[model samples]
Target chain A: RTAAQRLYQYNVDLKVAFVLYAVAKLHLPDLLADGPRTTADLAAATGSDPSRLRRLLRAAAGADALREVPEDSFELAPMGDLLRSGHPRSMRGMTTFFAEPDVLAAYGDLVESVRTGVPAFQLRHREPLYDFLARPQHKEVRDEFDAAMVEFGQYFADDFLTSFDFGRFTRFADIGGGRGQFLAGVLTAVPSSTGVLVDGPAVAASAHKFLASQNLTERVEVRIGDFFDVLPTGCDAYVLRGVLEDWADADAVRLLVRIRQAMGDAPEARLLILDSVIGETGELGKVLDLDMLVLVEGEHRTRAQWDDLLARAGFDIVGIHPAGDVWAVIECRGT
Target chain B: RTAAQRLYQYNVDLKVAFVLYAVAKLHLPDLLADGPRTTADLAAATGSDPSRLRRLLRAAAGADALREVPEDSFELAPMGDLLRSGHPRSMRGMTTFFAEPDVLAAYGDLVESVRTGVPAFQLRHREPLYDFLARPQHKEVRDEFDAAMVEFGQYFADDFLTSFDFGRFTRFADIGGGRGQFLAGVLTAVPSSTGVLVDGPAVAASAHKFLASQNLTERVEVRIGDFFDVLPTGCDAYVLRGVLEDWADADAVRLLVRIRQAMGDAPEARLLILDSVIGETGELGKVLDLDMLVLVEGEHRTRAQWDDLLARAGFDIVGIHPAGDVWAVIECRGT
Candidate 1:
């Protein structure tokens, strides 16, 4: 296909996804969960117009998110299954995030970001992402954002635990860890080790509740603090899971420096930088890097860049290990 | 892959596309049009910050839309060729349309549309699409919309002429045809046949100018009218290319009735129903169908449904011919 065709396809795909997200929220998937439901039945169940539902079903079927089994009846495709509330690892949160008006609106200033080495979100919304998330008015948006992050954590958490030697550390602090999902996984993997879940107050509240539910409340400490300000001390290792990518080099260095300050020249204290590193070569790396650039002010860095940042932040690189396609563990110690 | 993985991939694809569109507007492709350009060169040429341009380029390379040729230089990918302004089928207008804030904002209400059986655009904007386009304040937006339609016309004009027999009719009216590209192609193919171009007054103005530029104005009659209200009378055939698919059944039937009234009888006048009649099975067809649902309040119909609708509107289906993967020509005659 031509570039125009490809781009047009991309636009259509997004719009289609938006439409499906809307229909899915209207309980389309739940209505079709049992079997292929007729348009009239779906409309009745959802309290929508039968004719309009038929048109939506036809359109949804075209996107392959849903399928029309008979003339007027519809069923879920594999794509539609992701919209089901009960589906394992359902992507409803991510979908909701993508379709969110505020998030989508932020992208309008992407050109501004390109014109200046600053986040378009900050330029348009007049505040940093974290600050915006903290506002009471943005509570629902914050919840959706946290839900998506937690969903993403579920995908790589197992690989993250299995790929590293968590047993080597006596205690681990999950810096910027939201809701303790990763910490719980790590705690489970290394029963002898306790963990500190450090993030903002709102996130810490959820982390406290989640850790308690997992029966690791005594083993884990939920601390409300900015990683850029100061990390909770006394842990042999600090795991910055998906944290560093949210800031630029200077801010990332500040975070690393804070961790180093908390470590206080303890030779055994390691900082496990677990995040997506731009690969030396590959589309995945480039895409993730761009994602960071557009969504935040950060760019996914290579190992060399990461090393430079760590060295500048008063830390020495110990080792680097690839955990998954886009993620890695960059182990470091205070200089 | 699991459904979650597929959805994740889709979401990533969308995010990348938005960034690509932003870069395209920033003239990233134009800068790289000649050859690989350095970060500084790109920034200078496009009036962008070098660091941010570098970041976008890195991200673009990640999406395989461009390639990082050297340390700080970038080159267009085969996919990025369409980004060049001179590319024959450049979808610049389509990109602008997709990235438009108001249009994207309307999409936030897509769920409301599904629940209430009302169009999200009308609900959010308090007007129909045409009214929104017709406003004096929306001149630039309407122009972009027009340019995009013209781009589509240029891309499909060749395929359309090749797939249908224009020799069957002496005079043809392109109902709701924007800028008369389709009619111009027909006039070129069958020079002896006269043509009428019908659309809203604003769009008709452009069609008038375009027809005149093609030097077919002498052979064409331009009429500004709503398809639901009236069409030009006494034409050998009336073309509804890419029109019916944009309306619900009642509106579509009303359009067909207008044509029937204008023509005086169904059997005496030919109605070429040309648009995407989505196949009963296939990925591409399904995608396009859903695109219409979200972006516009339209649905792709099956062959039988097409026939039923035509019959209800007082026309007899003559034949159905496939043009491409997504589009088709359903020839009908006034009964």
Candidate 2:
């Protein structure tokens, strides 16, 4: 594929992403998990039109998400397994989060975001992203988001946490870490450390539920509050993964300041800013930098910008280590 | 990737299709045809947002549709070149047609189509697919269709025509040829044969315009009528390309019967059913077979079924030839 072909492929695959997301939402794979089933059977199970189900299934098959035998029945293809709700590494939440009506509608208005240079998510929902995600009416949307964290944490959270040594700290705090997937992963990884997970009230409730089910309740505590106001205090180690990019410079610094104050007297305390750093070079970083513009006001800041930002918030950068794709773990401390 | 993984890839790539489609609609590729340009350059030229254009361009680059250089500018990739408007093999109409709000929206409500046996297309447009496509208000949608035929016909229409020799025929009429793309391809391939195209009024006008634009006016004529009612007669060959799948068994057989009556007892004439047969099974055929269920009350019939339908219409199936993806060339004659 040439440039346009590649572009076209990406452009088109985005829709493919949407349909696959729909297939996941429809729970078609789980229905077909037992065996190959005809469109009629799947539709009957889902209360969808048999005909329409056939098309969706066909479309999914075109994406290689489902397989159809000559007999016109379908089986879950391997690519589609990750979309199954019960799969441990399922993209159910991640895809659902992106395919959510609000997020999709926001991307639909991409031109508007470019024109105003403001987050389209804010415009589409009539509120900032955090507010929209926290609204009681949007619990389903938030749940979709938690799935995304689950997807990320399953694959990369441990990889990120493992990149740095967390054994040096006794208390670990995860700030604005929605639903506690990262905290759970980290706590489970470091058997010697106790942890605190912090986020909005609704998200914290979900985190509590998730942590309790994970059998980490005895070793972890949940903090339900705005990270912008106050992050959990008295922590020698704080994990802030992928949350800073959503905010403006002032709010970003203010959030960092709270974390700084939380570790006031602990000279050894460090805040691990786990995020995709917009470096001077790299394809992944550049692409992700642009994605930030499409959905949020936050720019994927460069290394110098990060240095300036942390310095402004009375913190010193220890080192920035490449963790994984588009993610860099920056160890920081109060200056 | 396992079968489910393959399926998931297909499903997710559908979203990629949408994004590529949006890029086509935005004419982003066409804009970059000559050389690389910055996001700001494109935004100014296309009257889109600088920020949003950057995001789209970046997203497209991620798909490899476009190349974003270290210099912060973009140029078309090979894949994206297929989306250019003027290219003979361009997917302009193809992407435009599918990406149109209605068709895309119909897919959005696929669950509806799956539950009922009816075409979700009718429900989405609040009218039948044919009427909605041919209405004056939806000429743009009809135009989107012209491109799809262009795509299907470019590599394959001639394959179908060449499969059976058109040397014996002087005149060929394409039933529901829709905007004359395949007819033009066929007629151009068989220079000695003049052609007539059958479709609704708006589509006929579009065909005339496209035919004239393609410099095919002298060799081809247009007849505006429904195939369900009366088809133009006196042709030695009549071609129906993937049109029958939109009707029920009775209606499909009825449509063939209409062509049978139109051909009457013309000794030299044959009606070629150019459509997907559910007979041969592969990923493409299977996926497309399922695609038939979405918006049309149609089915990709098997060869035996085609044999039965043509037999009921008092015609004998001479032979069925493999033409292309989603197409099996079935040639028939009056018994």
Candidate 3:
């Protein structure tokens, strides 16, 4: 393709996402789960304007999210199936969360964010993203956020559980782990190993309920407090997955230092960091770094940045291994 | 690729566009035209935060809009060069226009638009899109919009020029033609043919100056009035390019009837409609149809819609030919 074509595609794809969001929000995939349906019938079922809904469905089909089986009738394509609410790998929450009005509107301040190094979300809400999400009025947004994160954890669950040796440790702690999906995966992998989850009050309570649902409540412990505060001590392994990227160097170092303090100089204690390691992830990581920059004030770090960060917190990097595409496991120990 | 990967790519590409907008807004391509520059130097030049700007640049590189060489230093790729203000084929205005604050915010009401069959723009502004653009306070936005249209004219200029035979007509009127780019192209192709352009006061003035700049002021006449009110008569052909898509069937038929009235009983007078023909445009046209639905209340039409619309306006379809990949020339005559 020519540069003109590529540029046009890049700009037009933005509209495709908005169209996808509307389709997902309307549950078009769920409606089409049984068989192909005509636009009028689907519109009637969803209470959307038939003409308007027809146009959006055409756009969704164009985006490869839906298939036009017989002119006006439609069925779910593979990408569309993932948008169904009951699909095993459903991404409806994640798709809707990012395209939500507040989140989309926050990007209007992106140029300002670029100028001042403040997050676009901060510039828009006049508060940090987490603070905005924690408000009572924003409980729905927070629920959507947690649901989206669980989708991601499920996506990487198998890769993460198999990435390291969980059987070697009797107990392991998941720092800032919300809802206990990853922790449950690890405990299930090593039946003898007990688990600890550190998170905030709301997330901890949710994790407590989730672990019980997983039938692992007896083996798992939930600690309700900020991970930045005093962490649980005496765990043979301390794991931080997908957390550090949401913070800057100073705060990240502080969190790492707190984790080191919890390690207590045990000879065999290990620190495992699972995040996107820049330079290792190709184009996706580079763009995701900007995602962190605009949505929150965090960043994906290069090897140099990670090295400096860990050394500042008094840890030595032992090994770096790819868990799956675009994510890595960094094994570390106290210096 | 798996459905998971495709879904992820679709979501991530939306972020790429916002990054592209920030780059164009800062004129990063213009600054890097001479040679590759480090992130610090480029940041200082643009008055952006170095760290934040670096993340954006990396994102740009990842999106293939920029090339990262010598580690932190950067250079323009072909798409990046097209964002430069002085480039011959510059798309800077169009790139920035779609991602502008109000435009991005308008899409937030897309769900409502889908449900009610009203434009998202209308839902958000409580007025039609043109009315919003015509306000004195929105002069800046109106200017940006016209400038962006000019960019598109330049993009499709060559394709349009070569697609049709303009030498046969003695005189042609470009109805709703703004800034005379297409008119100039037609006149240049056939030096002996004179042309008339009908538009509102503001756009007519711009077209007047633009035609003069092309040294075709004497041959091409500018008439200031709404095309729906009164159109210039006695022309061999009347051209309405890219205008009908912004209007619904009733309004579009009314405009076509007015043109037929202007054409009088002249047996040889032709009416040319240049717009996206839905079934012919594959993916781009399909997605752009949703674009029309959200941004305005208009839509791209199929052959059935067009035939019904023209017949209701007392015209018979003569020919339909592709002008470009996504657009077509539909020739018609009074029944």
Give the candidate number with the greatest DockQ: 3
Candidates 1 and 2 compared: the better one by DockQ is 1
- Residue B285 in model 2: shift from native, Å? 3.7
Candidate 1 pairs with clashing backbones: A62-B286, A62-B287, A63-B286, A286-B62, B266-B334, B266-B335, B267-B334, B267-B335
Rank by lDDT, highest first.
3, 1, 2
Between candidates 1 and 2, the TM-score winner: 2
| Per-residue alpha-carbon lDDT of candidate 2 for residues B1-335, written as tens digits (9 for 90 to 100) | 45434433443454455456667877888888898988778888878767567766776676567887766798987777888987766867766666566676665555555566566677667787777877998887787786665664664555566566766778988888888888887777777889988888857677888899989899887878766764777888988877776666788788878788888787878988777666454445555543355456667777788788788888888887776555677888899
**Alpha-carbon shift of residue A143 in model 1 (angstroms):** 1.8
Candidate with the greatest TM-score versus the true structure: 3
Per lDDT, the best of the predicted structures is 3
Q: Per-residue lDDT for A35-65 in model 1, tens only?
A: 8987888887888778666766777776678
Interface RMSD of each: 2.5, 4.4, 1.6
What is the C-alpha lDDT profile of model 1 across B74-192, one tens digit per residue? 89887777766678667767767766787777777766676776677777787777788989999877867776776767766766778778787898888877788888888899968
Q: Give the CAPRI rating of model 1.
A: acceptable
Taken over the whole model, the C-alpha lDDT of each candidate is 0.75, 0.71, 0.82
TM-score per model over all chains: 0.79, 0.80, 0.84
